[PDB]
Amino acid sequence: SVQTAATSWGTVPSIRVYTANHGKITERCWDGKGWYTGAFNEPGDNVSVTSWLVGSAISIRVYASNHGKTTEWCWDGNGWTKGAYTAT
């Protein structure tokens, strides 16, 4: 009262699983060898994710919902940044 969101890309593939548990959203990564803890760590009770490739460059969008409000987080190769998404 655990909630997950998953995305994958490429043919290896790379997989990312985001878990919202105890008011925190964390990330677990698979790139073909084993699972490791990712850099994503934001407060939230709910999470959704989508991702796309531009050649070999991955872009991830994580929608983290905390206390009635939804924040979009972007991964575009170098660090997680807050996105332009708003609910209204």
For residue 2, what are its two tokens?
């655990």
Please, what is the minimum distance in Å from the beta carbon of residue 45 to Zn ion?
5
On the question of a cis peptide bond just before residue 43, with omega within 30 degrees of 0, the verdict is no
12 within 8 A of 32, measured Cβ to Cβ:
yes
CA pair distance 83, 88, nearest whole angstrom: 14
Could you tell me how many residues of this chain bind a second copy (CB under 8 A)?
Answer: 43
Which one of residues 56, 78, 79, 86 is an interface residue with a second copy (CB under 8 A)?
Answer: 86
Spacing of C-alpha 14 from chain mean position:
13
Select from Zn ion, a second copy, none the partner in contact with residue 70, using the beta carbon and a kind-dependent cut-off of 5 to 8 Å.
a second copy
The half-sphere exposure of 42 on its side-chain side, counting CA atoms within 13 A, is 21
Please, what is the minimum distance in Å from the beta carbon of residue 23 to a second copy?
12
Q: For a second copy, which is the closer residue by CB, 68 or 79?
A: 68
Q: Does 6 bind a second copy (CB under 8 A)?
A: yes
- By CB under 8 A, the residues from 33 to 52 that bind a second copy are 34-35, 37, 45-52
